[PDB]
């Protein structure tokens, strides 16, 4: 939110001249703010999980656990118990 968008939201959600502060305006403003903060967290996770290989690792373990089920199910079930998986 720059100053201009903030000001567009107000002009939109207003119900009379001077409405910088109806329930509707505030809600619209909080929504814009909450949205921008939320896409921050979304894109951080996206580019931390990617940059540091979390999805790589998880998919790696997926395949190994799958092959472990299949090659030795007993050990497999013992293992996911000991790791709280």
Resolution (A): 2.4
Structural class in CATH, domain 53-85:
special
- Which residues contact residue 9 at a Cβ distance below 8 angstroms, ignoring those fewer than 6 apart? 25, 28, 29, 32
Tell me the C-alpha distance between 6 and 15, whole Å.
Answer: 16
Cβ atoms 15, 22 nearer than 8 A: yes
Cβ atoms 15, 24 nearer than 8 A: yes
20 secondary structure, DSSP code: S
Please give the CATH topology (third level) of the domain spanning 1-52: Helix Hairpins (1.10.287)
- Which residues contact residue 36 at a Cβ distance below 8 angstroms, ignoring those fewer than 6 apart? 1
Tell me the C-alpha distance between 72 and 60, whole Å.
Answer: 18
The helix-helix angle for 23-49 and 3-13 (nearest 10°) equals 140
The answer to whether the Cα torsion of 57, 63, 66, 68 is positive or negative is negative
| Residue ranges of domains in the chain | 1-52, 53-85
């Amino acid at each position: 939110l720059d100053s201009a968008k903030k000001a567009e939201i107000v002009a939109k959600f207003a119900k009379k001249p001077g409405d910088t502060g109806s329930t509707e305006v505030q809600v619209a403003l909080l929504t814009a703010r909450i949205a921008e903060l939320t896409e921050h967290l979304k894109i951080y996770k996206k580019d931390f999980s990617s940059r540091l290989g979390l999805l790589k690792l998880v998919g790696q373990r997926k395949r190994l656990l799958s092959y472990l089920k299949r090659k030795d199910y007993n050990s497999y079930s013992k293992l996911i118990t000991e790791l709280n998986l």
